[PDB]
Design a protein around this ligand. Structure first.
Ligand SMILES: O=C(COP(=O)(O)O)[C@@H](O)[C@H](O)[C@H](O)COP(=O)(O)O
Ligand SMILES: O=C(COP(=O)(O)O)[C@@H](O)[C@H](O)[C@H](O)COP(=O)(O)O
Ligand SMILES: O=C(COP(=O)(O)O)[C@@H](O)[C@H](O)[C@H](O)COP(=O)(O)O
Ligand SMILES: O=C(COP(=O)(O)O)[C@@H](O)[C@H](O)[C@H](O)COP(=O)(O)O
Ligand SMILES: [Mg+2]
Ligand SMILES: [Mg+2]
Ligand SMILES: [Mg+2]
Ligand SMILES: [Mg+2]
Ligand SMILES: [Mg+2]
Ligand SMILES: [Mg+2]
Ligand SMILES: [Mg+2]
Ligand SMILES: [Mg+2]
Ligand SMILES: [Mg+2]
Ligand SMILES: [Mg+2]
Ligand SMILES: [Mg+2]
Ligand SMILES: [Mg+2]
Ligand SMILES: [Mg+2]
Ligand SMILES: [Mg+2]
Ligand SMILES: [Mg+2]
Ligand SMILES: [Mg+2]
Lengths: 390, 390, 390, 390
């Protein structure tokens, strides 16, 4: 049977600030999806947060880009907004749905979606990822590693079924152009694009041998609003594993170096991506509570839940960053976070100016007097005396 | 609607010594505040300890410096004293209320208060802090950082709504004088005062753009008793966050370096301020149990609980030091505590003599024979022979 | 007496690659400057390298922007080129003087200059810095710290002679505009500019009390060549110290966090700025041999030589990063270098695309087929089957 | 034969700033003492620096407090001043001799002296210490440890010849009073005094069994100048070792924890005392070049030179901090220095106000408007509106 797996994610309020979600939001969402399941809209579901982002993972047979499934998610987020977030006056209530939400970040751009449709294999292990305080390009390095780096995915070299590699669908989110690159042969060209994490983002990956969908990342084109590019952050990602696709452990190895990503405070910094445990996982209630964002509204975090599909039912989720081996990775991220923070307001800890979600540069340039450089050389002594006397 | 948020804190007994509180004290206090809520005295509340200090966080509409609210707290502490602490003969039972409590530290000086009244915003995130084994000036460094240090609060540079800075109300607790300083321009003068943490303490902070209350720290003037200055330690602090006020994560960043503070053993040492987890947080019962004070009666610790206000009701609290990123900070504090303790009785691990809560110097000077220095030079050989023969 | 201190620096060949200089280049330069000294062109000099960059430090009385002094340096570099670098076929022989040098990086842009003229004080301590494998904005963070950060320069708070702060001359190297900002009051605006290290660079600093020159950094406007901005990297910096200017140790404290800077391999990465020892310092021969660039052509390094001026004569230089306290800083930089390198070709370890000195993006875009995104959605299955069958 | 060992120390100029000395100063001093030796004024000598402080170690038979020996030192420092420091316009030329030296710290207070007279033992091992960037009380902890702490000096417990302990001569430098305390019995009283490192300083130690001089520290009473106490910093210390006095290694163990001391930048901070190697030791030329002061004008450092006396001749010196065991201690000090520096201008990293060598507090209090606290409560809203509108 063919199944679709859809993650539709949104922030509709934080608790407090942008640090976390209120547990009643998860409970409300789970109850709403249980009703949809009883009506046959969906087969199964799992509800979880990372930071202030709620992921609705849903299995169904309606295909990709389905209005009923996308509409079920939207309605669930709108009802969480109105019944829970507005009731408790949560921070940024309705953030991703309402352009006038009470927060100062990018609002009203809508949910994000990562989805795949496929014939369910004789065993169908999948991993759902969610990150907070980062951009969709945060997953470029891990996706490259797991599908194309022989230092990550041993199977590329030792599993004859993987020898032919993978096909990357890369979205230029500025010009709205798609590129298809094949590894190993196009590795250098691919990296020339996807190293620019804010512009060229891996959106989908397919197995080269047969075209099977292997991963789907939530990324959309940017919008140009009041002369700035405006994106949708805090990505979600679906990866299918095993049997010629990377092993669960090869997928997870791709997150074992907590690389610097763009986001963190005010969408305007770089910090290490910490692979984080869930606070709690309740398979029966279909809810996981993910990590909080604390120092400097982070560091950026990613959570990983594994599942096994059966006739579209989801057995799981299983927290896949829960191992002492990943404690070392978290400790590294914590130390790097402390190191980089001592840079304060300077690039490359602060992002390049065009990549900053917040800026005061127009306010600054409206007040600080410029001097054409060539004329300034003649007048410098005069201008310095004027400040001094001034 | 306008709301007042009041934290009124006291130590009325420890369990054991000065290390912690008895959980029945928290339960008694919560039950008493629930009765006040039913009668309409207060809107909502949360009860928690850090070390041996119990904070009663209360929301209400009676304004600052209200006799009913201050009296409700006093009565709650007196009843905890009589019903719980005296019953179990807790250490320092009634400490802050009774000058004759059974402990050897400063007694009977009264509760402390941190409170703010304001129009409740469309979302109203607040953080309540409590520290044990330190002075109110322990918060000088964090408050300075979060409101004035561009290496902490990115918004000062990148959020045009924050560009105008903040107004610090600084209390000289020796001469009972208030100073108002504005950052950025008065930063150096401000620091010249508040670096003297025992004398010049940040009591309130206001937003410069509109005068909005931003933070309130519990500090009062010193009392001169038997020729020593006597202060009220173990401060509490309220901070409003977001939307032109520092982000929750910028507030928390201000605690990410575990700086040395005055207090620790016997109110007479310097040690690192450890940002500590709560042992437990129960939002339904309205109680959090904070950390214990162990080695050398510390190290000094601060706890952070976040809330969202709605019509004065408190949704929370949320432990905001609960992240692996803060595990690194705690480990640093633990290592610094071990390093500094090897100094034993010497400044600057021991405090300056006028800053020590305990001293034996009068006992010492009553017994040890002085010699005027000029005459001692002539007699030194004689005096050494007299000790030797002696 | 008034004196001018000029550092004029260039790379005219490496040994091997871009890692270091040949010692005969330094010996040749020193001999040439000794001849100029005998003729009265200059008072005194010191010759040294950091990585592949040779600094000619010269004292004289000809003022800033003097053709004789600039011409003496140019001629010295041209003769080193022809007599030494071309003789031994050094790598990038004549790099900064010859557009057709044999190297693949930016060539022929000319030497850089950092110079100050002033009345020589009753004691005149100065520090000369040189960095390799980085941009002039690498010094933005240190210069800000030493002149404006009270966590670095204690004197801003505790030395009444410094209370009035400093004046920063900031160059916009894209639009060729100069801004004058005064600290403390303009700190936030200043940081809003100079955090963009590739665009807004501190060129000079002056004391606010009297206008005295305090620092001079080597930065020039960019050139727009074949549609890319082309800059002059590997900066040099002069700082005057003490007596109302930052102490030598406050200047050095500003380098005690090895912050990430732009440059390193191929002028296209970010890595930690390591404060490095000189290999050797010979005050009598007037030559210091600085550090090599090794792993990944770095990490980026800065060297610091202190001097005392007397009637323009230079007593020194003294290696000011030579202390076990700075061994810790170097070890931190070495560890951060290893961490960040595991990112490979990805931002923010790789620089933003417009900031990269090397790029293959045009070659890539000439070969990889784009698909307009809207039409790609309809054709995706077809295109994937075509790659698969292909 | 009876011998006197005298260390007379002064700063008469730095190279650069307060970081180090010029090597010609040491060479000049050694040459001058060689002439005094030829004339029979002294028996032997050794000349060395730590940071910007030059120690003249001299052996002779003229006794303590001898005008000829003190005058020889003064004259040597005055000639170094005039012939070397003023010639090269060194920083703070003549610092400790000239009230109008060109530096901003405490000037003209004179050299310091540590001296002992005794019958030369059948073997006479002695250690000379010098510290820079700290007060004489920096040696209180080490002197206490080596003579009174059984966790340091094993001989107190296991060497029957040491069982009777030691006599401490403690100087109150504020009131000019001397106390004599005997360990073990007076340990607690002693520590009650000498923990106040700025006031009660160990000046001499004697063996209790026979009164033999065991140590001499350079400390003098403070001077009250323009309402501030003014002291003489950067102490020197002589310790006799072995045979009922602490072993060389017990003396050195007392420095193996790099405890926080007062001094460092601007005489106004606390930082770890690093036991440092000499850069070079030349026994034949009678000169050792000690460490530089770098980050933040430190950290504070102590050097240790061991000697064996024979008929007053000095065989040595031997650098006693030169062992990998002390590399660990230095690394600890380097890490603690980095930790504490993140506190910036705040106590207890900044010193208590009365202990600061530099302050801007009068300048601050002359400009910042005070409000009596009781009246401020009524007017606060008005004053905040006035700043806001202002
Ligand atoms: O060693 C492994 C499994 O052995 P096990 O069942 O524990 O004996 C795994 O590493 C697998 O080899 C890996 O996950 C690839 O599995 P397939 O995708 O080939 O099933
Ligand atoms: O990036 C952040 C929030 O993004 P998110 O909701 O996770 O997309 C935060 O760092 C906020 O920018 C920060 O807390 C300031 O928020 P405001 O006070 O401007 O709402
Ligand atoms: O073990 C030691 C010497 O043994 P050694 O000569 O190496 O056999 C030292 O620790 C001494 O015991 C110590 O220095 C005390 O020596 P005295 O002062 O008793 O001579
Ligand atoms: O403590 C210091 C010097 O003391 P010293 O000569 O060793 O007694 C330095 O930190 C100076 O205070 C600092 O360099 C500032 O010096 P000035 O610029 O005021 O001379
Ligand atoms: Mg949010
Ligand atoms: Mg989010
Ligand atoms: Mg965001
Ligand atoms: Mg988001
Ligand atoms: Mg108590
Ligand atoms: Mg307490
Ligand atoms: Mg107390
Ligand atoms: Mg208390
Ligand atoms: Mg080169
Ligand atoms: Mg170079
Ligand atoms: Mg270059
Ligand atoms: Mg170059
Ligand atoms: Mg000096
Ligand atoms: Mg000194
Ligand atoms: Mg000094
Ligand atoms: Mg001195």
């Amino acid at each position: 049977m063919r199944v679709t797996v859809s993650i539709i994610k949104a922030d509709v309020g934080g608790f407090p600030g942008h640090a976390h979600v209120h547990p009643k939001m998860l409970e409300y969402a789970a109850a709403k999806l249980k009703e949809a399941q009883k009506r046959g809209v969906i087969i199964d579901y799992f509800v979880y947060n990372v930071g202030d982002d709620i992921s609705l993972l849903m299995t169904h047979t309606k295909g990709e880009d389905n209005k009923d499934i996308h509409g079920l998610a939207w309605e669930t987020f709108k009802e969480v907004t109105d019944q829970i977030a507005k009731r408790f006056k949560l921070y940024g209530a309705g953030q991703d749905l309402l352009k006038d939400a009470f927060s100062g970040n990018i609002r009203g751009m809508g949910p994000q979606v990562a989805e795949m449709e496929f014939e369910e294999r004789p065993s169908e292990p999948i991993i759902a990822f969610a990150a907070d305080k980062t951009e969709p390009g945060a997953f470029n390095l891990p996706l490259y590693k797991m599908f194309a780096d022989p230092f990550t995915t041993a199977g590329l070299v030792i599993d004859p079924s993987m020898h032919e590699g993978f096909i990357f669908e890369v979205l230029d989110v500025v010009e709205h152009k798609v590129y298809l690159l094949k590894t190993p042969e196009d590795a250098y060209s691919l990296l020339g694009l996807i190293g620019t994490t804010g512009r060229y983002i891996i959106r989908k990956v397919f197995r080269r041998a047969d075209g099977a969908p292997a991963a789907a990342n939530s990324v959309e084109r940017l919008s140009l609003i009041a002369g700035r590019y405006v994106g949708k952050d805090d990505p979600v990602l679906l990866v299918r594993a095993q049997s010629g696709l990377p092993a669960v452990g090869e997928v997870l190895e791709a997150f074992a170096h907590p690389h610097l990503v763009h986001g963190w405070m005010r969408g305007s910094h770089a910090g290490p991506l910490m692979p984080a445990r869930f606070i709690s996982v309740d398979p029966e209630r279909r809810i996981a509570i993910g990590p909080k964002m604390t120092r400097f509204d982070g560091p950026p975090k990613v959570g990983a839940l594994g599942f096994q599909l059966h006739e579209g039912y989801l057995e799981g989720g299983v927290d896949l960053f829960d191992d002492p081996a990943f404690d070392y990775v978290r400790q590294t991220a914590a130390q790097i976070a402390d190191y980089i923070r001592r840079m304060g307001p300077f690039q490359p800890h602060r992002l390049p100016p065009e990549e900053m979600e917040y800026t005061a540069l127009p306010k600054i340039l409206a007040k600080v007097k410029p001097y054409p450089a060539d004329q300034y050389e003649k007048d410098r002594k005069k201008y310095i005396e004027a400040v001094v006397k001034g």
